[PDB]
Short mmCIF file of C-alpha atoms and ligand atoms in Angstrom, two decimals:
data_model
loop_
_atom_site.label_atom_id
_atom_site.label_comp_id
_atom_site.label_asym_id
_atom_site.label_seq_id
_atom_site.Cartn_x
_atom_site.Cartn_y
_atom_site.Cartn_z
CA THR A 1 20.93 5.95 -31.06
CA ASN A 2 18.83 3.18 -29.58
CA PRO A 3 15.11 3.77 -28.97
CA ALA A 4 14.80 0.89 -26.46
CA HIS A 5 17.66 2.27 -24.39
CA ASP A 6 16.18 5.78 -24.61
CA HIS A 7 12.74 4.65 -23.41
CA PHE A 8 14.11 2.35 -20.69
CA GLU A 9 16.21 5.21 -19.31
CA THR A 10 13.23 7.63 -19.36
CA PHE A 11 11.07 4.93 -17.68
CA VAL A 12 13.59 4.53 -14.86
CA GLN A 13 13.71 8.31 -14.14
CA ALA A 14 9.98 8.99 -14.65
CA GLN A 15 8.39 10.87 -11.74
CA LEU A 16 4.81 11.01 -12.97
CA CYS A 17 2.44 8.13 -13.60
CA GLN A 18 1.63 9.33 -17.13
CA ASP A 19 5.37 9.44 -17.93
CA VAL A 20 5.92 5.95 -16.58
CA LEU A 21 3.11 4.61 -18.77
CA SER A 22 4.11 6.46 -21.94
CA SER A 23 7.83 5.59 -21.71
CA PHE A 24 6.90 1.95 -20.98
CA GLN A 25 4.71 1.81 -24.14
CA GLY A 26 7.62 3.28 -26.12
CA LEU A 27 9.87 0.63 -24.63
CA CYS A 28 7.39 -2.13 -25.57
CA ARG A 29 7.15 -0.82 -29.18
CA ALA A 30 10.96 -0.75 -29.47
CA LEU A 31 11.35 -4.32 -28.19
CA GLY A 32 8.51 -5.98 -30.07
CA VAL A 33 6.46 -6.72 -26.96
CA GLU A 34 3.21 -5.66 -25.24
CA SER A 35 2.56 -4.27 -21.76
CA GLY A 36 0.36 -6.38 -19.48
CA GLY A 37 1.72 -9.54 -21.10
CA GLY A 38 3.01 -11.59 -18.17
CA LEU A 39 6.44 -13.09 -17.53
CA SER A 40 6.97 -14.00 -21.21
CA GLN A 41 7.16 -10.30 -21.91
CA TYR A 42 9.48 -9.66 -18.95
CA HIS A 43 11.80 -12.31 -20.42
CA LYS A 44 11.83 -10.68 -23.88
CA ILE A 45 12.39 -7.21 -22.46
CA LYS A 46 15.31 -8.20 -20.21
CA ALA A 47 17.01 -10.36 -22.89
CA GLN A 48 17.12 -7.27 -25.12
CA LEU A 49 18.43 -4.92 -22.40
CA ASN A 50 21.65 -6.57 -21.28
CA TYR A 51 23.41 -3.23 -20.95
CA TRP A 52 24.79 -0.66 -18.48
CA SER A 53 21.49 0.94 -17.46
CA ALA A 54 19.51 -2.25 -16.82
CA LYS A 55 21.88 -5.17 -16.03
CA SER A 56 21.81 -4.85 -12.22
CA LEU A 57 18.02 -4.72 -12.15
CA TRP A 58 17.53 -8.01 -14.03
CA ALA A 59 20.03 -9.60 -11.65
CA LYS A 60 17.87 -8.57 -8.66
CA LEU A 61 14.51 -9.44 -10.21
CA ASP A 62 15.74 -12.82 -11.54
CA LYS A 63 17.15 -13.63 -8.08
CA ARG A 64 13.74 -13.11 -6.50
CA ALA A 65 11.96 -14.86 -9.39
CA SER A 66 14.20 -17.94 -8.87
CA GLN A 67 13.08 -18.56 -5.26
CA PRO A 68 11.63 -22.11 -5.09
CA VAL A 69 8.16 -20.99 -4.02
CA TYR A 70 7.48 -19.47 -7.50
CA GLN A 71 8.33 -22.74 -9.30
CA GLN A 72 10.05 -20.73 -11.98
CA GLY A 73 6.80 -18.85 -12.79
CA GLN A 74 4.77 -22.04 -13.04
CA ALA A 75 3.09 -22.09 -9.63
CA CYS A 76 -0.10 -20.24 -10.65
CA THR A 77 0.07 -20.45 -14.41
CA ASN A 78 -3.64 -21.41 -14.65
CA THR A 79 -4.75 -18.78 -12.16
CA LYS A 80 -6.43 -15.52 -13.25
CA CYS A 81 -6.46 -12.62 -10.80
CA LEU A 82 -8.00 -9.18 -10.53
CA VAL A 83 -6.37 -6.77 -8.11
CA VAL A 84 -8.28 -3.66 -7.01
CA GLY A 85 -6.07 -0.67 -6.18
CA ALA A 86 -2.63 0.54 -7.23
CA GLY A 87 -1.69 1.66 -3.75
CA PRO A 88 1.61 0.36 -2.33
CA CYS A 89 -0.14 -2.82 -1.12
CA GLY A 90 -2.11 -3.82 -4.29
CA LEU A 91 1.03 -3.11 -6.34
CA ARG A 92 3.16 -5.21 -3.97
CA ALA A 93 0.58 -8.04 -4.11
CA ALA A 94 0.50 -7.92 -7.92
CA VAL A 95 4.24 -8.17 -8.12
CA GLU A 96 3.90 -11.37 -6.08
CA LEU A 97 1.06 -12.82 -8.21
CA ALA A 98 3.17 -12.01 -11.27
CA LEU A 99 6.21 -13.87 -9.93
CA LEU A 100 3.97 -16.88 -9.23
CA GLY A 101 3.10 -16.96 -12.92
CA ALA A 102 -0.55 -15.93 -12.52
CA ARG A 103 -2.37 -13.78 -15.05
CA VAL A 104 -2.65 -10.39 -13.23
CA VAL A 105 -4.99 -7.53 -14.11
CA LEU A 106 -5.21 -4.55 -11.79
CA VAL A 107 -7.78 -1.80 -11.78
CA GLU A 108 -7.22 1.62 -10.20
CA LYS A 109 -9.91 4.38 -10.01
CA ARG A 110 -7.41 7.25 -10.06
CA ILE A 111 -4.93 8.22 -12.83
CA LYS A 112 -1.98 9.68 -10.91
CA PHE A 113 -0.06 9.24 -7.65
CA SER A 114 -0.73 12.40 -5.71
CA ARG A 115 0.03 11.67 -2.07
CA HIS A 116 3.21 13.07 -0.52
CA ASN A 117 2.74 11.91 3.09
CA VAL A 118 5.58 9.81 4.46
CA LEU A 119 5.39 6.16 5.56
CA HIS A 120 7.53 4.38 8.14
CA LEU A 121 9.25 1.18 7.00
CA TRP A 122 10.27 -1.82 9.10
CA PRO A 123 13.71 -3.37 8.34
CA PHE A 124 12.15 -6.26 6.38
CA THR A 125 10.38 -3.90 3.99
CA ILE A 126 13.52 -1.88 3.34
CA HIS A 127 15.33 -5.13 2.41
CA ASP A 128 12.30 -6.25 0.39
CA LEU A 129 12.22 -3.09 -1.69
CA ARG A 130 16.01 -2.91 -2.21
CA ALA A 131 15.76 -6.51 -3.49
CA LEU A 132 13.22 -5.41 -6.13
CA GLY A 133 15.60 -2.70 -7.46
CA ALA A 134 14.36 0.29 -5.40
CA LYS A 135 17.78 2.04 -5.58
CA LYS A 136 17.72 1.95 -9.42
CA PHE A 137 14.28 3.57 -9.49
CA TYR A 138 14.64 5.93 -6.50
CA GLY A 139 18.16 7.21 -5.81
CA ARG A 140 17.23 8.50 -2.38
CA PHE A 141 15.74 5.21 -1.18
CA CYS A 142 16.20 4.55 2.58
CA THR A 143 19.64 6.14 2.47
CA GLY A 144 21.63 6.25 5.73
CA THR A 145 19.66 5.25 8.76
CA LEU A 146 16.50 6.54 7.05
CA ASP A 147 13.57 4.16 7.24
CA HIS A 148 10.66 5.97 5.54
CA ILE A 149 9.36 6.84 2.07
CA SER A 150 6.64 9.11 0.63
CA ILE A 151 3.56 7.29 -0.59
CA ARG A 152 3.87 8.41 -4.23
CA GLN A 153 7.59 7.43 -4.43
CA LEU A 154 6.74 3.95 -3.11
CA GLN A 155 3.94 3.74 -5.74
CA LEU A 156 6.28 4.83 -8.54
CA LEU A 157 8.92 2.23 -7.87
CA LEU A 158 6.39 -0.60 -7.32
CA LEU A 159 4.52 0.50 -10.52
CA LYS A 160 7.78 0.13 -12.49
CA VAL A 161 8.48 -3.37 -11.16
CA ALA A 162 4.82 -4.42 -11.74
CA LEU A 163 4.93 -3.21 -15.34
CA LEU A 164 8.24 -4.94 -16.10
CA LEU A 165 6.80 -8.14 -14.63
CA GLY A 166 3.87 -8.01 -17.04
CA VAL A 167 0.98 -6.95 -14.79
CA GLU A 168 -1.89 -5.49 -16.85
CA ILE A 169 -3.00 -2.20 -15.27
CA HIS A 170 -6.09 -0.14 -16.01
CA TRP A 171 -6.49 3.41 -14.77
CA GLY A 172 -9.53 5.67 -14.17
CA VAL A 173 -11.69 2.58 -13.58
CA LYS A 174 -13.57 1.91 -10.37
CA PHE A 175 -14.31 -1.64 -9.19
CA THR A 176 -17.98 -1.54 -7.98
CA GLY A 177 -18.74 -5.21 -7.41
CA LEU A 178 -19.01 -8.60 -9.04
CA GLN A 179 -20.98 -10.05 -11.93
CA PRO A 180 -21.83 -13.61 -10.78
CA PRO A 181 -21.49 -16.48 -13.31
CA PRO A 182 -24.76 -16.48 -15.35
CA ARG A 183 -24.62 -20.27 -15.98
CA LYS A 184 -22.53 -23.47 -15.87
CA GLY A 185 -19.35 -22.84 -17.90
CA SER A 186 -19.31 -19.12 -16.99
CA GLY A 187 -16.72 -17.44 -14.76
CA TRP A 188 -16.75 -14.47 -12.42
CA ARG A 189 -16.41 -10.96 -13.86
CA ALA A 190 -16.22 -7.49 -12.29
CA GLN A 191 -18.65 -4.57 -12.30
CA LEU A 192 -16.58 -1.55 -13.43
CA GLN A 193 -17.28 2.16 -13.84
CA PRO A 194 -17.28 3.61 -16.34
CA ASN A 195 -17.97 1.01 -19.10
CA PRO A 196 -14.65 -0.79 -19.86
CA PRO A 197 -13.36 -2.27 -23.21
CA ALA A 198 -14.56 -5.70 -24.37
CA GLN A 199 -11.45 -7.41 -22.96
CA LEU A 200 -11.83 -5.88 -19.46
CA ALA A 201 -15.64 -6.11 -19.33
CA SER A 202 -15.41 -9.79 -20.22
CA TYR A 203 -12.28 -10.51 -18.14
CA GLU A 204 -12.94 -13.60 -16.03
CA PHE A 205 -10.96 -14.34 -12.89
CA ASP A 206 -10.89 -16.93 -10.07
CA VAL A 207 -9.01 -14.71 -7.57
CA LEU A 208 -10.00 -11.20 -6.44
CA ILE A 209 -7.50 -9.26 -4.32
CA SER A 210 -9.02 -6.12 -2.85
CA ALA A 211 -6.35 -3.55 -1.90
CA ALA A 212 -8.60 -0.55 -2.21
CA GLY A 213 -7.55 1.21 1.03
CA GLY A 214 -9.19 2.23 4.27
CA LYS A 215 -12.48 3.57 2.91
CA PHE A 216 -13.23 0.66 0.62
CA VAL A 217 -15.87 -1.51 2.29
CA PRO A 218 -15.43 -5.13 1.06
CA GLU A 219 -18.66 -6.99 0.21
CA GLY A 220 -19.62 -10.14 2.10
CA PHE A 221 -16.85 -9.37 4.62
CA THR A 222 -17.66 -8.56 8.28
CA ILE A 223 -15.73 -5.50 9.43
CA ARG A 224 -15.00 -4.79 13.11
CA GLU A 225 -14.97 -1.17 14.18
CA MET A 226 -14.28 0.34 17.54
CA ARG A 227 -14.78 4.00 18.28
CA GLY A 228 -12.26 4.90 20.98
CA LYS A 229 -11.65 8.20 22.72
CA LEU A 230 -11.75 11.06 20.23
CA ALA A 231 -8.35 11.62 18.55
CA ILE A 232 -7.66 14.03 15.69
CA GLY A 233 -4.64 13.55 13.46
CA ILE A 234 -3.04 16.30 11.43
CA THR A 235 -0.36 15.80 8.77
CA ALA A 236 1.75 18.53 7.17
CA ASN A 237 4.42 18.70 4.49
CA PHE A 238 6.96 21.47 4.28
CA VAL A 239 9.46 22.15 1.48
CA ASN A 240 12.81 20.54 2.19
CA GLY A 241 15.60 22.48 0.41
CA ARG A 242 18.09 19.77 1.48
CA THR A 243 20.65 22.31 2.75
CA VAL A 244 23.44 21.09 5.05
CA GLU A 245 21.75 23.03 7.86
CA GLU A 246 18.37 21.36 7.34
CA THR A 247 19.97 17.89 7.48
CA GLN A 248 21.33 18.49 11.01
CA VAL A 249 17.81 18.72 12.45
CA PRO A 250 17.07 15.39 14.13
CA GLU A 251 13.98 13.45 13.23
CA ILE A 252 11.30 12.72 15.84
CA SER A 253 10.18 9.07 15.76
CA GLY A 254 7.26 9.75 18.12
CA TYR A 255 2.86 12.60 27.23
CA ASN A 256 6.02 10.73 28.23
CA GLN A 257 7.66 14.17 28.06
CA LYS A 258 7.82 17.63 29.66
CA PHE A 259 7.86 18.65 25.98
CA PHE A 260 4.08 18.61 25.54
CA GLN A 261 3.48 20.89 28.52
CA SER A 262 6.12 23.37 27.31
CA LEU A 263 4.52 23.24 23.86
CA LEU A 264 1.07 23.95 25.37
CA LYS A 265 2.36 26.89 27.44
CA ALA A 266 4.15 28.63 24.56
CA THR A 267 1.56 28.12 21.82
CA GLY A 268 -1.71 26.81 23.29
CA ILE A 269 -1.17 23.61 21.31
CA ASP A 270 -2.26 20.47 23.18
CA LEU A 271 -0.77 17.39 21.52
CA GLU A 272 -0.77 13.69 22.44
CA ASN A 273 2.05 12.86 20.02
CA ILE A 274 4.22 14.35 17.27
CA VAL A 275 6.35 12.77 14.50
CA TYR A 276 8.90 14.38 12.16
CA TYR A 277 10.37 12.56 9.10
CA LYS A 278 13.05 14.24 6.99
CA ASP A 279 12.03 13.00 3.53
CA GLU A 280 11.26 14.63 0.14
CA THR A 281 9.43 17.12 2.36
CA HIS A 282 9.78 17.93 6.06
CA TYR A 283 6.78 15.80 7.05
CA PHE A 284 4.92 15.99 10.38
CA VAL A 285 2.07 14.01 11.86
CA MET A 286 0.57 14.89 15.21
CA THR A 287 -2.47 14.04 17.30
CA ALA A 288 -4.27 17.03 18.81
CA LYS A 289 -7.01 17.34 21.43
CA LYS A 290 -10.28 18.86 20.16
CA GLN A 291 -10.48 21.60 22.83
CA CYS A 292 -7.26 23.35 21.70
CA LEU A 293 -8.38 23.02 18.04
CA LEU A 294 -11.64 24.84 18.78
CA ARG A 295 -9.81 27.37 20.95
CA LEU A 296 -7.17 28.10 18.28
CA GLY A 297 -9.69 28.59 15.43
CA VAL A 298 -8.84 25.40 13.47
CA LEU A 299 -12.37 23.95 13.96
CA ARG A 300 -15.40 26.25 13.43
CA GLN A 301 -18.00 24.37 15.58
CA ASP A 302 -17.97 21.82 18.40
CA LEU A 303 -19.83 19.08 16.53
CA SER A 304 -20.55 15.79 18.31
CA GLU A 305 -20.20 13.69 15.13
CA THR A 306 -16.51 13.16 14.25
CA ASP A 307 -17.06 13.18 10.47
CA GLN A 308 -18.88 16.51 10.68
CA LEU A 309 -16.30 17.88 13.15
CA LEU A 310 -13.44 17.06 10.74
CA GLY A 311 -15.49 17.70 7.59
CA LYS A 312 -14.37 20.32 5.03
CA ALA A 313 -16.97 22.84 6.27
CA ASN A 314 -15.70 22.84 9.89
CA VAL A 315 -11.94 23.10 9.20
CA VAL A 316 -10.42 26.55 8.55
CA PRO A 317 -7.41 26.10 6.22
CA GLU A 318 -5.55 29.25 7.32
CA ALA A 319 -5.83 28.33 11.02
CA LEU A 320 -4.87 24.68 10.36
CA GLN A 321 -1.77 26.05 8.57
CA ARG A 322 -0.77 28.31 11.52
CA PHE A 323 -1.41 25.40 13.90
CA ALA A 324 0.73 22.89 11.99
CA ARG A 325 3.59 25.33 11.37
CA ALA A 326 3.63 26.47 15.01
CA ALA A 327 3.78 22.87 16.29
CA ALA A 328 6.42 21.81 13.74
CA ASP A 329 8.48 24.93 14.48
CA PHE A 330 8.32 24.28 18.23
CA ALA A 331 9.03 20.54 17.91
CA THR A 332 12.20 21.19 15.87
CA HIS A 333 13.28 24.21 17.96
CA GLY A 334 13.24 26.54 14.94
CA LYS A 335 16.24 24.77 13.45
CA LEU A 336 14.55 24.22 10.06
CA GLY A 337 14.37 28.03 9.65
CA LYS A 338 11.23 29.54 8.13
CA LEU A 339 8.95 26.65 7.16
CA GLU A 340 7.11 26.87 3.85
CA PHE A 341 4.26 24.47 3.18
CA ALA A 342 4.81 22.19 0.23
CA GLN A 343 1.98 22.17 -2.26
CA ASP A 344 -0.43 19.29 -2.58
CA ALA A 345 -1.44 17.98 -6.02
CA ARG A 346 -3.98 20.83 -6.37
CA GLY A 347 -1.46 23.59 -5.46
CA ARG A 348 -2.76 24.14 -1.90
CA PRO A 349 -0.61 24.17 1.24
CA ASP A 350 -0.23 20.50 2.06
CA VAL A 351 -1.84 20.11 5.46
CA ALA A 352 -4.87 18.03 6.42
CA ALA A 353 -6.89 16.78 9.40
CA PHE A 354 -7.96 13.15 9.88
CA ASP A 355 -10.10 11.01 12.13
CA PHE A 356 -7.67 8.98 14.27
CA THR A 357 -10.54 7.77 16.52
CA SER A 358 -11.98 4.71 14.84
CA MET A 359 -9.87 1.70 14.06
CA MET A 360 -11.22 -0.94 11.73
CA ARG A 361 -10.16 -4.47 10.95
CA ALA A 362 -11.81 -7.17 8.88
CA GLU A 363 -13.10 -10.14 10.80
CA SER A 364 -11.52 -12.44 8.19
CA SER A 365 -8.85 -11.81 5.53
CA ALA A 366 -10.44 -14.03 2.88
CA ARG A 367 -13.70 -15.60 1.65
CA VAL A 368 -14.74 -17.96 -1.16
CA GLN A 369 -17.87 -17.66 -3.33
CA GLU A 370 -19.13 -20.34 -5.70
CA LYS A 371 -21.94 -20.23 -8.22
CA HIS A 372 -22.65 -22.58 -11.14
CA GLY A 373 -19.44 -24.51 -10.46
CA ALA A 374 -17.20 -21.44 -10.68
CA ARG A 375 -15.19 -20.68 -7.54
CA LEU A 376 -13.86 -17.27 -6.59
CA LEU A 377 -11.25 -16.72 -3.91
CA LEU A 378 -11.46 -13.25 -2.33
CA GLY A 379 -8.54 -11.78 -0.36
CA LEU A 380 -8.11 -8.44 1.50
CA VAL A 381 -4.69 -6.79 1.58
CA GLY A 382 -3.49 -3.48 3.16
CA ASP A 383 -5.54 -0.71 4.81
CA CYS A 384 -8.86 -2.36 3.76
CA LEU A 385 -7.87 -5.44 5.79
CA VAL A 386 -6.59 -3.62 8.90
CA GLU A 387 -6.49 0.16 9.21
CA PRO A 388 -3.07 1.34 10.47
CA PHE A 389 -2.65 3.96 13.22
CA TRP A 390 -0.23 6.17 11.30
CA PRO A 391 2.00 7.39 14.14
CA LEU A 392 2.91 3.77 14.98
CA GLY A 393 4.12 3.05 11.45
CA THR A 394 2.71 -0.46 10.81
CA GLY A 395 0.92 0.37 7.55
CA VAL A 396 3.48 -0.71 4.97
CA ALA A 397 4.75 -3.65 7.08
CA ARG A 398 1.36 -5.25 7.79
CA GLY A 399 0.13 -4.38 4.29
CA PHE A 400 3.10 -6.21 2.79
CA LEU A 401 2.70 -9.16 5.18
CA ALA A 402 -0.97 -9.32 4.13
CA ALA A 403 0.14 -9.12 0.46
CA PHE A 404 2.56 -12.11 1.05
CA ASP A 405 -0.02 -14.19 2.97
CA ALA A 406 -2.63 -13.50 0.22
CA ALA A 407 -0.16 -14.57 -2.48
CA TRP A 408 0.80 -17.73 -0.55
CA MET A 409 -2.92 -18.37 -0.18
CA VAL A 410 -3.28 -18.08 -3.97
CA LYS A 411 -0.42 -20.60 -4.43
CA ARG A 412 -2.32 -23.03 -2.15
CA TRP A 413 -5.53 -22.35 -4.13
CA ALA A 414 -3.67 -23.02 -7.39
CA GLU A 415 -2.48 -26.36 -5.93
CA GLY A 416 -6.11 -27.43 -5.54
CA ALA A 417 -6.23 -27.34 -1.71
CA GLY A 418 -9.97 -26.58 -1.80
CA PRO A 419 -11.92 -23.64 -0.35
CA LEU A 420 -12.08 -24.62 3.36
CA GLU A 421 -8.43 -25.61 3.71
CA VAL A 422 -7.18 -22.50 1.90
CA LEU A 423 -9.29 -20.25 4.14
CA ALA A 424 -8.33 -22.05 7.40
CA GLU A 425 -4.62 -21.74 6.61
CA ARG A 426 -5.05 -18.05 5.65
CA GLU A 427 -6.99 -17.31 8.86
CA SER A 428 -4.40 -19.09 10.99
CA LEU A 429 -1.91 -16.58 9.54
CA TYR A 430 -4.34 -13.64 9.90
CA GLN A 431 -4.66 -14.23 13.70
CA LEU A 432 -1.00 -13.04 13.97
CA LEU A 433 -1.13 -9.83 11.93
CA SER A 434 -2.22 -7.27 14.51
CA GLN A 435 0.48 -8.54 16.94
CA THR A 436 3.42 -8.56 14.51
CA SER A 437 6.59 -6.68 15.25
CA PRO A 438 10.19 -6.88 14.02
CA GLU A 439 11.04 -8.28 17.46
CA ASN A 440 8.63 -11.22 17.31
CA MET A 441 9.19 -12.21 13.67
CA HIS A 442 12.05 -14.15 12.05
CA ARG A 443 15.30 -12.16 12.51
CA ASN A 444 16.82 -13.00 9.10
CA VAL A 445 14.87 -10.59 6.86
CA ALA A 446 17.13 -11.34 3.88
CA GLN A 447 15.49 -14.78 3.75
CA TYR A 448 11.88 -13.57 3.92
CA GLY A 449 9.69 -14.95 1.18
CA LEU A 450 6.09 -15.95 0.43
CA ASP A 451 6.41 -19.11 2.54
CA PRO A 452 5.02 -17.91 5.90
CA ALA A 453 7.55 -20.20 7.74
CA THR A 454 10.24 -17.77 6.54
CA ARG A 455 8.48 -14.90 8.29
CA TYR A 456 6.53 -16.17 11.31
CA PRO A 457 8.44 -18.11 14.03
CA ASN A 458 6.95 -21.43 15.25
CA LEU A 459 4.08 -21.34 12.76
CA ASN A 460 0.72 -22.87 13.69
CA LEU A 461 -0.97 -23.19 10.26
CA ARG A 462 -3.80 -25.14 11.99
CA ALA A 463 -4.72 -22.52 14.65
CA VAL A 464 -7.96 -22.34 12.64
CA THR A 465 -9.46 -25.52 11.16
CA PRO A 466 -11.56 -26.20 8.01
CA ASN A 467 -14.71 -26.59 10.18
CA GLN A 468 -14.25 -23.18 11.83
CA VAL A 469 -14.21 -21.27 8.50
CA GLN A 470 -17.41 -22.74 6.96
CA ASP A 471 -19.22 -19.37 6.97
CA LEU A 472 -16.41 -17.97 4.81
CA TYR A 473 -17.38 -20.29 1.94
CA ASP A 474 -20.59 -19.19 0.24
CA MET A 475 -21.35 -22.20 -1.95
CA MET A 476 -24.63 -21.19 -3.56
CA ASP A 477 -25.22 -24.51 -5.37
CA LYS A 478 -23.85 -28.02 -6.04
CA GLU A 479 -22.59 -27.48 -9.61
C1 LIG B 501 -4.89 10.72 1.92
C2 LIG B 501 -4.06 9.71 2.65
C3 LIG B 501 -3.04 10.14 3.51
C4 LIG B 501 -2.31 9.21 4.23
N1 LIG B 501 -1.31 9.69 5.07
C5 LIG B 501 -0.58 8.79 5.81
C6 LIG B 501 0.44 9.22 6.67
O1 LIG B 501 0.71 10.41 6.83
N2 LIG B 501 1.16 8.27 7.38
C7 LIG B 501 0.85 6.93 7.25
O2 LIG B 501 1.48 6.10 7.89
N3 LIG B 501 -0.15 6.50 6.41
C8 LIG B 501 -0.85 7.41 5.67
N4 LIG B 501 -1.86 6.93 4.84
C9 LIG B 501 -2.07 5.44 4.73
C10 LIG B 501 -1.05 4.87 3.74
O3 LIG B 501 -1.11 5.60 2.54
C11 LIG B 501 -1.38 3.39 3.49
O4 LIG B 501 -1.24 2.66 4.69
C12 LIG B 501 -0.48 2.69 2.44
O5 LIG B 501 -0.45 3.39 1.21
C13 LIG B 501 -0.94 1.25 2.21
O6 LIG B 501 -2.31 1.34 1.86
P1 LIG B 501 -3.00 0.46 0.73
O7 LIG B 501 -2.10 0.30 -0.44
O8 LIG B 501 -3.68 -0.71 1.32
O9 LIG B 501 -4.21 1.45 0.34
P2 LIG B 501 -4.13 2.93 -0.29
O10 LIG B 501 -2.77 3.52 -0.21
O11 LIG B 501 -5.29 3.69 0.32
O12 LIG B 501 -4.42 2.68 -1.82
C14 LIG B 501 -5.72 2.23 -2.23
C15 LIG B 501 -5.81 2.45 -3.74
O13 LIG B 501 -7.02 1.83 -4.19
C16 LIG B 501 -7.67 2.77 -5.05
N5 LIG B 501 -9.12 2.48 -4.98
C17 LIG B 501 -9.95 2.67 -3.92
N6 LIG B 501 -11.19 2.21 -4.25
C18 LIG B 501 -11.14 1.69 -5.50
C19 LIG B 501 -12.11 1.09 -6.33
N7 LIG B 501 -13.32 0.74 -5.86
N8 LIG B 501 -11.71 0.68 -7.59
C20 LIG B 501 -10.42 0.88 -8.02
N9 LIG B 501 -9.46 1.45 -7.19
C21 LIG B 501 -9.82 1.86 -5.96
C22 LIG B 501 -7.32 4.14 -4.52
O14 LIG B 501 -7.52 5.12 -5.50
C23 LIG B 501 -5.86 3.95 -4.12
O15 LIG B 501 -5.00 4.20 -5.21
C24 LIG B 501 -2.60 7.85 4.11
C25 LIG B 501 -3.62 7.43 3.26
C26 LIG B 501 -4.36 8.34 2.53
C27 LIG B 501 -5.50 7.81 1.72
CL1 LIG B 502 1.73 10.96 -10.86
#
């Protein structure tokens, strides 16, 4: 028996964060390496696992790692990064920073991956993930014509790649701000809760990537919010027994129908849209009008403030359950048989209401701060950059594009391009993000890489100039 093989194989199949971490530590012990140790550790792990279970994975990862943009792991070798958030986007960003050869530490306030809701994937992201070994880590990955994945499964497979690539991850620690350089010769550090170990507390970095999700409010960044017409989203997960009969039930990708009237007549349910993905669960997302929610007992009081309206006190869980099951049942014409709610992490029926009204996007995707001669590049990636409207399925795509554009920006930074040029180039790319679609991007997704010219047709990297981004560079002194 071979402990390294045993731990690698457990690591591959692990379905819980704690199991991924513990099997990875066992693997590191067996192979004479450390976790969080950069590409040198990746090289030592893979050299020692040239065998049936692992061979195909190293082939894929080495293929990506060999793309010219990474300069064989030397592009950012003097760059130190802190990534905030182990969501799909912060993990995807870290993988990229790791391939560039940067030192990558990532902090995440939670300690498990608990979300089961299902995310739509554009063709480029499906290729992207397959090319990182998704099939090895997740046997069900975008099989057939399926183009979606549950959040926690996406997190698990990206966590595994990040770990193999030597990203140093800390859990149960909340990024709360920055400790500015105290004097010349000092670097930037993070404010973290609760008190972290000497190494983390004193960890200095020149790049901060914030991928902390929709509710994180980035400091120094201007955020644009528009409150539109009230819209209330509801998501639900039902147990999928994966029977032959259940598989026949067609998905619903997304009133342009007589359907919504016939739904309203039969049930009293007034919807604007409904979506059904056949994933690890039978997952539904729908947008409901407030008046039918009040009428059907889902909402207790007609409160004018949306966050009170959709607050825990105003939502009746039993009525929300009847509402979601009745809509899902009607939408799929009963062909899923008797729907049973899947359980959330806490053991409750997995159904929830969300504010679909306000859409937020950062005014800029990056800033630079300098104090005492120490420069810090700050980048936003994922939901904290632009909040996705879930039914339209742009979340993973635009999060990953933001992750790529941030990493390219870090390559430019590492080249010594200087704060204003780095920001102007990044912002020229950012102007495109909310208009992106598969249709208007480069068609050859197999050739997508960090270089934005691989991804964005007829690229104007000067759409924004150095002079226009001056306010994004907070140079506090001349040191
Ligand atoms: C509860 C929930 C349900 C969702 N349901 C759907 C859905 O049904 N369909 C859909 O399309 N999209 C859904 N989304 C959005 C989808 O999950 C995201 O678009 C996708 O995961 C990419 O987001 P992200 O990685 O930028 O941020 P997130 O997935 O939000 O990840 C952010 C991470 O940062 C961590 N974090 C936050 N603050 C800090 C801090 N200060 N310090 C350290 N770590 C921090 C969080 O714990 C989290 O792990 C949902 C999101 C949530 C939060
Ligand atoms: Cl978990």
